[PDB]
Write an enzyme that holds these catalytic residues in place. Structure first.
Site, mmCIF file in Angstrom:
data_model
loop_
_atom_site.group_PDB
_atom_site.id
_atom_site.type_symbol
_atom_site.label_atom_id
_atom_site.label_comp_id
_atom_site.label_asym_id
_atom_site.label_seq_id
_atom_site.Cartn_x
_atom_site.Cartn_y
_atom_site.Cartn_z
ATOM 1 N N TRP A 217 4.020 11.139 17.056
ATOM 2 C CA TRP A 217 4.904 12.134 17.647
ATOM 3 C C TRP A 217 5.986 11.414 18.431
ATOM 4 O O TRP A 217 5.832 10.252 18.801
ATOM 5 C CB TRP A 217 4.165 13.125 18.560
ATOM 6 C CG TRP A 217 3.288 12.491 19.565
ATOM 7 C CD1 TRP A 217 3.671 11.922 20.748
ATOM 8 C CD2 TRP A 217 1.869 12.336 19.485
ATOM 9 N NE1 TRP A 217 2.574 11.427 21.410
ATOM 10 C CE2 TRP A 217 1.455 11.674 20.659
ATOM 11 C CE3 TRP A 217 0.908 12.701 18.539
ATOM 12 C CZ2 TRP A 217 0.119 11.360 20.905
ATOM 13 C CZ3 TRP A 217 -0.415 12.398 18.787
ATOM 14 C CH2 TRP A 217 -0.799 11.737 19.954
ATOM 15 N N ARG B 114 0.772 2.958 21.992
ATOM 16 C CA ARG B 114 -0.470 2.457 21.414
ATOM 17 C C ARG B 114 -1.723 2.883 22.161
ATOM 18 O O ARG B 114 -2.814 2.502 21.731
ATOM 19 C CB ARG B 114 -0.424 0.939 21.336
ATOM 20 C CG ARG B 114 0.609 0.440 20.377
ATOM 21 C CD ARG B 114 0.619 -1.061 20.380
ATOM 22 N NE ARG B 114 1.410 -1.600 21.482
ATOM 23 C CZ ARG B 114 1.359 -2.867 21.873
ATOM 24 N NH1 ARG B 114 0.541 -3.718 21.269
ATOM 25 N NH2 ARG B 114 2.126 -3.286 22.873
ATOM 26 N N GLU C 121 13.896 8.757 21.912
ATOM 27 C CA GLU C 121 14.252 8.364 20.549
ATOM 28 C C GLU C 121 15.277 9.331 19.967
ATOM 29 O O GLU C 121 16.190 8.927 19.238
ATOM 30 C CB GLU C 121 13.005 8.313 19.653
ATOM 31 C CG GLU C 121 11.923 7.293 20.015
ATOM 32 C CD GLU C 121 10.696 7.398 19.104
ATOM 33 O OE1 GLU C 121 10.748 6.855 17.974
ATOM 34 O OE2 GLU C 121 9.677 8.017 19.508
ATOM 35 N N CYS D 104 5.476 -1.128 20.120
ATOM 36 C CA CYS D 104 5.055 0.268 20.198
ATOM 37 C C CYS D 104 4.519 0.606 21.586
ATOM 38 O O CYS D 104 3.492 0.065 22.011
ATOM 39 C CB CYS D 104 3.992 0.574 19.146
ATOM 40 S SG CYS D 104 3.407 2.261 19.289
HETATM 41 C C1 HEM Z 1 1.232 8.604 18.557
HETATM 42 C C2 HEM Z 1 2.479 8.677 19.035
HETATM 43 C C3 HEM Z 1 3.451 7.465 19.021
HETATM 44 C C4 HEM Z 1 4.454 7.318 19.874
HETATM 45 C C5 HEM Z 1 4.788 8.255 21.056
HETATM 46 C C6 HEM Z 1 5.163 6.075 19.577
HETATM 47 C C7 HEM Z 1 6.261 5.566 20.266
HETATM 48 C C8 HEM Z 1 7.090 4.569 19.784
HETATM 49 C C9 HEM Z 1 8.430 4.219 20.192
HETATM 50 C C10 HEM Z 1 9.297 4.868 21.309
HETATM 51 C C11 HEM Z 1 8.856 3.198 19.458
HETATM 52 C C12 HEM Z 1 10.268 2.583 19.679
HETATM 53 C C13 HEM Z 1 10.892 2.152 18.365
HETATM 54 C C14 HEM Z 1 12.276 2.715 18.236
HETATM 55 O O1 HEM Z 1 12.989 2.849 19.267
HETATM 56 O O2 HEM Z 1 12.661 3.020 17.080
HETATM 57 C C15 HEM Z 1 7.803 2.834 18.515
HETATM 58 C C16 HEM Z 1 7.801 1.825 17.568
HETATM 59 C C17 HEM Z 1 6.774 1.490 16.687
HETATM 60 N N1 HEM Z 1 5.602 2.206 16.477
HETATM 61 FE FE1 HEM Z 1 4.808 3.568 17.766
HETATM 62 N N2 HEM Z 1 4.542 5.506 18.459
HETATM 63 C C18 HEM Z 1 3.488 6.355 18.080
HETATM 64 C C19 HEM Z 1 2.623 6.183 17.012
HETATM 65 C C20 HEM Z 1 2.576 5.124 16.130
HETATM 66 C C21 HEM Z 1 1.715 4.971 14.961
HETATM 67 C C22 HEM Z 1 0.682 6.036 14.453
HETATM 68 C C23 HEM Z 1 2.022 3.777 14.409
HETATM 69 C C24 HEM Z 1 1.451 3.049 13.179
HETATM 70 C C25 HEM Z 1 0.291 3.389 12.608
HETATM 71 C C26 HEM Z 1 3.050 3.145 15.219
HETATM 72 C C27 HEM Z 1 3.626 1.909 15.013
HETATM 73 C C28 HEM Z 1 4.856 1.520 15.521
HETATM 74 C C29 HEM Z 1 5.587 0.346 15.113
HETATM 75 C C30 HEM Z 1 5.065 -0.667 14.053
HETATM 76 C C31 HEM Z 1 6.747 0.331 15.818
HETATM 77 C C32 HEM Z 1 7.880 -0.721 15.790
HETATM 78 C C33 HEM Z 1 8.413 -1.080 14.419
HETATM 79 C C34 HEM Z 1 9.886 -0.849 14.414
HETATM 80 O O3 HEM Z 1 10.289 0.284 14.734
HETATM 81 O O4 HEM Z 1 10.647 -1.789 14.109
HETATM 82 N N3 HEM Z 1 3.356 3.999 16.245
HETATM 83 N N4 HEM Z 1 6.737 3.693 18.757
HETATM 84 C C1 LIG Z 2 5.006 6.491 14.179
HETATM 85 C C2 LIG Z 2 6.288 6.700 14.953
HETATM 86 C C3 LIG Z 2 6.224 7.159 16.260
HETATM 87 C C4 LIG Z 2 7.405 7.335 16.975
HETATM 88 N N1 LIG Z 2 7.355 7.792 18.245
HETATM 89 N N2 LIG Z 2 8.593 7.065 16.404
HETATM 90 C C5 LIG Z 2 8.667 6.612 15.134
HETATM 91 C C6 LIG Z 2 10.031 6.350 14.552
HETATM 92 C C7 LIG Z 2 10.509 4.931 14.794
HETATM 93 C C8 LIG Z 2 11.906 4.866 14.195
HETATM 94 N N3 LIG Z 2 12.482 3.521 14.348
HETATM 95 C C9 LIG Z 2 11.748 2.594 13.490
HETATM 96 C C10 LIG Z 2 13.884 3.544 13.910
HETATM 97 C C11 LIG Z 2 7.513 6.433 14.367
#
Ligand code: HEM
Ligand SMILES: Cc1cc(N)nc(CCCN(C)C)c1
Ligand code: HEM
Ligand SMILES: C[C@H](O)[C@H](O)[C@H]1CNc2nc(N)[nH]c(=O)c2N1
Ligand SMILES: C[C@H](O)[C@H](O)[C@H]1CNc2nc(N)[nH]c(=O)c2N1
Ligand SMILES: Cc1cc(N)nc(CCCN(C)C)c1
Ligand SMILES: [Zn+2]
Lengths: 412, 412
Positions: free
Chosen positions: B281, B112, B286, B109
């Protein structure tokens, strides 16, 4: 212990067994992965024969004469020479094989579909810095081939005791000079300011400009290195223009045709060749993305976006992205219109997928470093983004080595 | 055993000690690195108290009451409850802490920097699929906040014996439908054709179009799941337009405001919450890179390059790259002009560097997965490309889990 790698664009799965022959260590443990660290962490006679044997067993396995007498006698012959001399000498055929396979096993190389078309130049009879310069010039002329670039390697004498080494101090045979300025800024290439330093400290009278080709700093048999300037007729350069934007030329940019890494170490059957400059042709992004737009390199995104009329106040206008594409279309276009070999990141990453396929088929795997195989722009629209890859160290191999101006016992 | 990570754009070095508290295994060995594999490789009472203890020791270490009696009694209290019930129940304060830190420790992530601003909704009193739908709707409404998006998680009852689980079968709360065609092609989202399948197999009458929001498939206490359609007034969507190219609207594209992962498992002190949908958000790429331009997703690079008047015959014209930038400037521009929270890949990757800095300072490290932190376009012109990162598993954590339609003992 027979792992699977999956493609998540095409659902293709391939089984890797080649990793069992892996020998060296990666830096990762069961509890921490270092796949994004850039470089993570004298030899004796007792260690040598295992490595000689292992190499000889696969070389004879390669020409389908595994357990022949020619193998058994070469095994005994090398053993006796490691007894007599505590080292040994490669046959010409074993040198070409080992070199081609060091390239084959280079997991950070996306170009390896060409690994068996490598011209090997045996420079192991060299004794002087002047000799190296001559060998190196012949390499540049050959590999360049009038813009019809050809892949080649020149192999200088192997390390013996340690303090008689042979090194090319340059990181590439052909690089542009780096000059800091009195006002703090930088002219030329900031990557090379510390190397451009020593050249001047050794009598190089610098033409303090931008794209000033550097002189070779060659060290022979552990002796203090010496400056030699490559005949400019052998240094082929491509002037960069855009196929639409006519103001592009006034930027006044150019790059050299031939990429040739000279600072690495070639390991074959436990023998270490500390000077082994090798050359191919450029993937366009190496120039248009890293050379020109790295913050600590030429750093030209400022000016290209300027003459494009872009919204540079806001980060989220992706002006930086938009100027990066134009620069790469122009690097590509300029090389092609001068018949100088270059490959775009799409064609190169497709070939590597196909090569990977051949390797899992007729070899059982293919060590690959994702972090380095994915191109530094437009990652996920090239097929290597979606391809799982296993990284592991196979030998023969190219390795990094300390910069020689830190190891050298310097004197005169 | 106190490793260093280097930035090769700024020469900054930071020392990682947090990896010593790492517990789980990565998939890499001393002899093979799997940092590019997508997902590499019932609980008993004896295993549970260690995990409960380890979690409780850091929670009390967090509020600066490490060895207090409140700690020692909570240790004894949880032990007795693991003796009596072979499981145990989290305090509300331990649930909020564990959830925030599971996000904190999510090495893939890039967002974070926000990890401590997480609204935690305690849904552990839920018993029915209708109850979940209600909790989930309240989550969508809150997290959306009229385009002023807010980060949130809803935590349903923890796994007990295994076959009474609670699962959201959807991979995201809000996704567009996937319909194959009689001529083989695909309408909507090809990623979801297998999930769109079950919905229809369960009575969903599909409005077979492109951007058809899917219904929730909620399973409560191991019971067979049930369809619920989110009130469309709660599903906020952004119509995609370009700030220069007026033909952009005729492409007729839109995306939903709220990204909310619903298919993962939240692990806290050895307790497993199999339904824990969480939302933030969007980072713009993405949508604009993966959703729209993945070959096996919407795959729109064809049509965007068409109406741009591009050289699509030649691969090396980088038409694909040029149409990818425009799409992302427009995704960004459309969200911002409707006041819907979104972040560009430059701002997001800068914040993560700053966050990383805070973590090495006040925590001793920050687990990071390079392969996932680097954005899928314009990699090396964002500061995370040049940042070495250590990956290791810390707990509390989010984990992957089998898709529920393969595990479920299905009946009716
Ligand atoms: C607040 C704004 C947030 C942004 C901008 C953000 C951004 C991202 C991005 C770009 C990815 C790339 C994954 C992909 O390409 O599908 C990701 C994955 C992930 N995010 Fe964050 N995220 C946010 C909030 C959160 C929150 C609130 C949580 C959990 C409470 C979280 C947990 C995760 C996890 C566990 C993954 C990786 C798991 C997976 O997709 O296999 N994120 N995030
Ligand atoms: C919490 C959250 C934030 C973010 N920026 N994007 C997502 C979607 C992740 C989709 N992938 C798991 C396929 C979730
Ligand atoms: C034939 C055309 C070739 C192409 C298109 C090509 C392409 C590339 C690219 C893009 C990289 C990325 C490294 C970087 O970003 O700096 C790379 C690295 C590398 N190449 Fe290849 N290459 C070619 C030929 C060769 C040859 C002939 C050799 C050796 C005999 C070789 C060995 C290596 C090694 C060892 C590395 C990684 C070492 C390092 O840079 O740290 N390549 N190559
Ligand atoms: C094979 C490879 O692991 C796969 O494409 C990964 C690479 N990195 C990624 N990074 C992010 N953020 N999202 C992804 O889906 C992927 N896919
Ligand atoms: C920190 C990181 O390892 C560093 O930026 C690497 C990442 N991947 C790379 N990949 C290539 N091909 N070349 C590079 O210089 C780098 N740099
Ligand atoms: C043989 C070769 C091929 C290629 N395409 N590029 C290079 C230069 C690599 C520069 N990096 C080590 C900084 C060498
Ligand atoms: Zn690893």
């Amino acid at each position: 212990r027979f792992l699977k790698v999956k493609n998540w664009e095409t659902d293709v799965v391939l089984t890797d067994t080649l990793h069992l022959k892996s020998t060296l260590e990666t830096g990762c443990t069961e509890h921490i992965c270092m796949g994004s660290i850039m470089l993570p962490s004298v030899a004796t006679k007792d260690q040598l024969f295992p490595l000689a044997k292992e190499f000889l067993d696969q070389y004879y396995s390669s020409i389908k004469r595994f357990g022949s007498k020619a193998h058994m006698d070469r095994l005994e012959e090398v053993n006796k020479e490691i007894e007599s001399t505590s080292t040994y000498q490669l046959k010409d055929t074993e040198l070409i094989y080992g070199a081609k396979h060091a390239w084959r096993n280079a997991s950070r190389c996306v170009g390896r579909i060409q690994w068996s078309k490598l011209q090997v130049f045996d420079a192991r009879d060299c004794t002087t810095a002047h000799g190296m310069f001559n060998y190196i010039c012949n390499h540049v002329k050959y590999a360049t081939n009038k813009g019809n670039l050809r892949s080649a390697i020149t192999i200088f004498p192997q390390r013996t005791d340690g303090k008689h080494d042979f090194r090319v101090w340059n990181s590439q045979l052909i690089r542009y000079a780096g000059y800091k300025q009195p006002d703090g800024s930088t002219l030329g290439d900031p990557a090379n300011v510390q190397f451009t330093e020593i050249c001047i400290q050794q009598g190089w009278k610098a033409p303090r400009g931008r794209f000033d080709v550097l002189p070779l700093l060659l060290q022979a048999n552990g002796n203090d290195p010496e400056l030699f300037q490559i005949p400019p007729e052998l240094v082929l350069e491509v002037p960069i223009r855009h196929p639409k934007f006519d103001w592009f030329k006034d930027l006044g940019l150019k790059w050299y045709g031939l990429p040739a890494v000279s600072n690495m170490l070639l390991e074959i059957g436990g023998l270490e060749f500390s000077a082994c400059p090798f050359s191919g042709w450029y993937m366009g992004t190496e120039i248009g993305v890293r050379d020109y737009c790295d913050n600590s390199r030429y750093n030209i995104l400022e000016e290209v976006a300027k003459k494009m009329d872009l919204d540079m106040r806001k980060t989220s206008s992706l002006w930086k992205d938009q100027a990066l594409v134009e620069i790469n279309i122009a690097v590509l276009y300029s090389f092609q219109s001068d018949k100088v070999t270059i490959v775009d990141h799409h064609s190169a990453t497709e070939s590597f997928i196909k090569h990977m396929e051949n390797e899992y088929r007729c070899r059982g795997g293919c060590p690959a470093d994702w972090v380095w195989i994915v191109p530094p722009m437009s990652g996920s629209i090239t097929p290597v983004f979606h391809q799982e890859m296993l990284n592991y160290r196979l030998t023969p191999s190219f390795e990094y080595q300390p910069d020689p101006w830190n190891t050298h016992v310097w004197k005169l």
